[PDB]
Each structure stands twice: as C-alpha cells, then as structure tokens.
C-alpha cells in the first residue's frame with residue numbers, strides 16, 4: 001500500500017511493533033531488495049538475498065557480531081567456521097535427537113501444569129499465563145536448576161542484554177561488569193558441582209562433551225549457556241502466542257486442528273513463518289560486492305530481514321494468507337546454513353506439545369476481542385506483549401496427585 005519509499009531506522013524497535021513493517025518490507029522487496037535505511041544501514045529483504053547471504057559466510061561474516069547495537073560476544077553465533085563448527089559440535093551434544101525426544105514427558109507435564117493454573121478461570125492472558133512461562137521453564141529444567149535459580153538466570157540475562165545495548169557512561173559499564181560477574185560466578189558454581197557429581201542435565205553434558213580432542217572451558221560453558229538462555233526463551237514465546245493468535249483468527253483452521261491433531265506439525269511451520277520472532281541477524285561484509293543491485297563495501301554490516309523474507313511473494317505465492325496447510329513451507333524463521341538454529345527441534349517440540357494440549361483442553365479458545373495484539377518494540381526479537389483470551393472453563397488435571 002506504501003506509495004512512497006519507507007523512511008525508517010531499522011535499529012528502532014518501534015519499526016517492528018507499530019505494524020507498518022510488512023508494508024515497508026513489501027516496498028523494499030519490489031523496489032530496493034537490499035535496502036539502505038535512513039542511517040545508511042543495509043538490509044537484505046528478499047528471500048533470495050537472505051538465502052544468498054546465508055549460503056556465503058565467506059563474504060557475509062558473523063564475527064563482527066550479529067547485532068547492530070551490541071559488541072560481538074564469545075559465543076558460537078558470533079563465530080565463523082572453522083571455529084564456529086567446533087564450538088557448535090561441542091554444544092550439539094546437548095541437543096541430540098535422543099536428548100530432545102527424552103524431554104517429551106517433562107515438557108508435556110509442564111504444559112499441563114500451566115494450563116491447570118488457568119483452565120477454571122474461563123479467561124487468561126495467553127502471553128503472561130501460557131506462552132511466556134513455558135520456554136523458560138523448559139530451559140530451566142534442561143539446565144537441571146531449581147525454579148528460583150531459573151528466575152535468577154532470567155533476570156541476569158535480561159540485564160546483560162540491556163547493558164550490552166547501552167554501556168556508554170562509566171557507571172553502566174560497571175553495572176554491566178557486575179552483572180556479568182554475578183551471572184558468571186553463579187553459573188560456574190553450578191558447573192563446578194556437575195564436574196564433581198554429574199547429572200543428566202545440560203551442564204553435565206557440556207562439561208563432558210569432547211570434539212577433536214577439545215573440551216569446553218568453564219567460561220565457554222557460561223557463555224554458550226547465556227546464548228541458549230537468550231536465544232531459546234522469548235523466541236519460542238512469540239511463535240507460541242502469535243501462532244496461536246492466527247489459529248484463533250482462522251476458525252476453520254482451528255477447527256481442522258481440533259478434529260485432526262496430525263495436522264499440527266504443518267500448522268507449527270506456518271506459525272513459525274508468520275511470527276518470524278527473530279526479525280534480523282547481522283553479517284559483516286568481508287569484501288566489496290554488488291549484491292542484488294546494491295553496492296556493499298567491505299566492513300559494513302548488513303541485516304538479514306527474516307520476516308521480510310518469510311513474506312516474499314515470489315517464493316510463497318500467497319504469503320499474506322495464514323495457512324496451516326502451506327506446503328512446501330521453506331521459511332527462514334530459524335535462519336539457514338551453518339548457523340541454522342541449534343534449538344529448532346526443541347522449539348518445534350515445545351510448540352507442538354503445548355498447542356496439542358491447548359487444542360484439547362481449551363477447545364473453544366477465542367481472542368477476547370479482535371483488535372490487533374500489541375507487539376514488543378525491540379529491534380531483535382519481538383512478538384505479542386499481551387493477548388487476552390476466553391474459553392469455557394474446565395477442570396485441572398493436577399497430575400502430581
């Protein structure tokens with residue numbers, strides 16, 4: 001609908017929250033596929049441009065850091081191969097198909113307890129009460145920590161992210177260092193405990209992981225854990241809430257899923273495409289190149305706009321329709337290539353198990369009202385801030401009795 005070129009700052013969180021992004025993306029894909037925003041920041045907005053960049057890390061490097069407004073960090077997403085590959089193989093010990101599928105019972109049980117807390121009410125905030133608690137509880141359990149310790153880790157990772165985005169004065173630098181120290185010392189205390197007396201938790205697995213004769217240091221484990229805390233929490237939340245929102249807005253598709261649970265995996269893929277919780281990841285050019293009509297220079301960052309790519313008309317045909325039967329559905333919500341989301345199968349499992357139970361226990365779930373759901377103004381990961389819903393009450397399972 002945009003008749004004029006978007007005049008936007010792609011580092012401004014409100015761009016991703018005010019609802020104007022998809023029509024801005026439409027203009028970019030049609031007119032200026034590798035777009036430069038009002039500060040000259042380049043962005044790959046078509047599916048082909050995103051995929052080309054992903055397939056060519058030699059040219060589009062991750063070592064400059066994957067944010068535009070934070071320094072590079074010592075975890076795997078800010079590495080190139082071969083370093084990245086080694087680190088990923090080490091951490092992958094925690095995410096084998098065996099270990100993910102072993103979480104089916106615990107995640108299912110977790111989902112039942114969350115729904116138990118709301119089922120008698122006839123209403124809840126789908127974000128606050130269902131979508132937000134689940135991913136963090138799953139990560140907490142995976143790490144083998146107590147709920148109280150989970151919550152400390154959550155607060156620390158929140159403060160670290162905040163600090164990393166702005167530590168200009170002398171004091172924010174120290175608060176940032178204090179927070180890093182607090183988080184590092186807590187996590188290393190846990191690591192030290194598992195080094196002596198191992199469990200089956202993710203800390204123990206990372207401690208024991210060995211690849212090409214190398215093992216992870218305590219600090220490496222601390223930072224890969226931090227990446228998992230950040231990367232696996234709000235992302236999963238936003239696909240759950242935003243994906244469910246679209247199911248609630250398309251009653252025929254909601255009904256189809258209620259009638260046939262085997263349709264759920266296809267539905268989850270469309271929930272992923274539509275929500276695209278990770279709005280962008282940055283790459284740094286290692287050479288000058290002319291890329292989809294734009295002159296890029298060595299050393300500049302470019303944003304890979306995953307939501308923009310996921311609504312590419314040349315690829316999806318009818319991307320502006322939400323359809324649980326979309327097939328094929330080669331969305332890039334999880335990225336593509338060597339950095340393809342390590343947690344993708346765990347995320348898909350959380351999404352499937354929760355939505356299964358929501359369909360079964362809240363079968364007449366509806367939005368309280370059809371107004372658009374408010375979105376988080378963040379330039380990295382974003383989705384619904386709240387989502388009031390209503391449903392016929394039902395009795396809690398209380399499975400531990």
Ligand code: HEM
Nearest residue numbers: 076077231232235236278281334335336339341342343347
């Ligand atoms: C809906 C949920 C999720 C989405 C949409 C998502 C999205 C992404 C994206 C876009 C990337 C970067 C890929 C690229 O640049 O090509 C990534 C990487 C990563 N994700 Fe996820 N993520 C999700 C859930 C999770 C979970 C649950 C975990 C772990 C428990 C996780 C851990 C990671 C890690 C460690 C990486 C770095 C992989 C690497 O650099 O090799 N993510 N994710």
